[PDB]
Amino acid sequence: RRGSFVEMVDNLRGKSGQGYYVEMTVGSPPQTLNILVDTGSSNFAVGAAPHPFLHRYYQRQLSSTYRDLRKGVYVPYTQGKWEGELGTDLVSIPHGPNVTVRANIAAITESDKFFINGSNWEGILGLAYAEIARPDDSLEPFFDSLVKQTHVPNLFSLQLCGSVGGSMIIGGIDHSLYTGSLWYTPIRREWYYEVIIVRVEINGQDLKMDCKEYNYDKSIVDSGTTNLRLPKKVFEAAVKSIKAASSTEKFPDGFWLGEQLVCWQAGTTPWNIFPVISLYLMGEVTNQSFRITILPQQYLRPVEDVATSQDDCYKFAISQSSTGTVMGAVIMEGFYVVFDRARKRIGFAVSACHVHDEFRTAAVEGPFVTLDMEDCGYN
Numbered sequence: 437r438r439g440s441f442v443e444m445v446d447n448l449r450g451k452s453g454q455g456y457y458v459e460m461t462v463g464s465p466p467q468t469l470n471i472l473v474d475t476g477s478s479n480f481a482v483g484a485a486p487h488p489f490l491h492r493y494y495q496r497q498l499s500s501t502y503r504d505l506r507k508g509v510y511v512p513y514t515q516g517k518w519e520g521e522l523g524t525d526l527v528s529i530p531h532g533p534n535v536t537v538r539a540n541i542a543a544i545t546e547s548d549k550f551f552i553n554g555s556n557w558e559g560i561l562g563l564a565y566a567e568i569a570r571p572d573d574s575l576e577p578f579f580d581s582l583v584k585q586t587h588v589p590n591l592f593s594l595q596l597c598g599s600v601g602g603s604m605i606i607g608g609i610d611h612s613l614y615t616g617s618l619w620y621t622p623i624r625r626e627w628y629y630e631v632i633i634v635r636v637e638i639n640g641q642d643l644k645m646d647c648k649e650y651n652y653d654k655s656i657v658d659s660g661t662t663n664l665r666l667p668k669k670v671f672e673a674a675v676k677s678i679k680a681a682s683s684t685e686k687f688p689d690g691f692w693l694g695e696q697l698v699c700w701q702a703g704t705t706p707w708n709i710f711p712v713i714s715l716y717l718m719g720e721v722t723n724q725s726f727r728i729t730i731l732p733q734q735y736l737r738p739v740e741d742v743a744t745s746q747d748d749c750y751k752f753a754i755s756q757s758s759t760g761t762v763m764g765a766v767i768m769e770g771f772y773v774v775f776d777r778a779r780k781r782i783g784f785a786v787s788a789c790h791v792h793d794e795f796r797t798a799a800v801e802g803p804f805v806t807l808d809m810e811d812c813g814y815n
């Protein structure tokens with residue numbers, strides 16, 4: 437099958453600011469779990485104990501196909517940790533391909549700041565590469581296992597629509613999910629989904645920064661992050677320009693730092709005072725680039741769970757980083773994104789579900805002439 441996969445359309449669910457999850461089954465007979473789709477990590481890890489925030493959890497004792505690996509894995513992040521016991525079991529995706537694979541599963545037995553109180557998911561599906569798997573690259577990621585064990589083509593694509601929805605098309609592309617053409621950027625290295633940004637424009641105005649800065653020390657595509665995250669020096673310049681572009685209204689310093697929210701009376705958000713953001717990405721051809729353009733609809737996130745206000749409150753979802761640029765849900769919700777593993781490239785097209793007003797629309801445009809794009813990468 438190619439170009440059309442109706443069975444996989446709308447197979448993603450979520451809640452605002454809590455991410456996008458797919459239904460999966462593990463073990464025999466099959467146990468159903470909701471699993472966060474994460475292109476920014478490479479472990480398949482699931483709740484395996486009755487943590488009070490969990491709707492449900494993997495019960496290894498009930499599975500005839502479970503195999504213990506007799507190894508543990510401890511995984512700390514910046515603000516959260518999990519620890520688990522490694523095994524393999526049979527895994528399938530009910531609204532995905534008609535297959536069942538034997539995959540590595542980390543059965544989570546202790547965690548902190550990992551499961552979200554009030555969320556509807558019980559595990560994470562790391563879709564990135566073995567190089568960043570925990571404990572090490574010998575632990576084969578789920579997608580690698582899927583590709584090895586079946587005839588599913590080595591590609592998946594994501595349409596994230598900002599409760600939220602979307603599509604994860606496994607092993608192909610569904611042409612109804614986008615308009616215009618796909619444009620492809622090389623995956624620089626197979627660890628995270630690493631790409632190179634060669635130029636940044638706010639409202640069409642170049643930031644005029646050494647492009648090496650845009651990728652200090654990394655730029656990645658990550659469905660498991662909400663924000664567009666930028667290196668501080670780039671974030672500094674970006675806000676500076678966004679501040680200027682939006683000067684007809686004035687907002688507090690903390691707002692731009694995500695230390696407080698800003699609110700407006702319902703239906704009266706000044707979208708138009710806010711500038712578009714354009715990232716030019718390295719193209720497929722020497723000296724050729726393309727640009728993807730997002731709206732304030734993307735970087736101004738509605739905050740729903742705010743009991744002390746009755747208005748429309750938003751978070752500024754652009755933030756600074758020490759680990760490089762992260763193109764999170766803020767970017768991806770604008771686009772249909774094709775993770776073309778077989779070809780080591782990521783395609784972007786205008787998403788058929790992206791949220792936009794009648795004056796501006798997210799865009800994917802090319803080709804553009806950009807020299808010295810190699811020098812944009814950090815070593």
Ligand SMILES: CN1C(N)=N[C@](C)(c2cc(NC(=O)c3ccc(F)cn3)ccc2F)CS1(=O)=O
Pocket residue numbers: 453454455456474475476477513514516550560658659660661662765
């Ligand atoms: C950035 N990170 C990432 N991509 N993957 C991890 C596994 C992760 C992701 C989430 N992601 C989310 O909860 C989330 C929330 C809203 C979104 F739009 C997208 N993702 C939660 C826990 C966790 F360990 C670790 S992380 O360092 O935090």
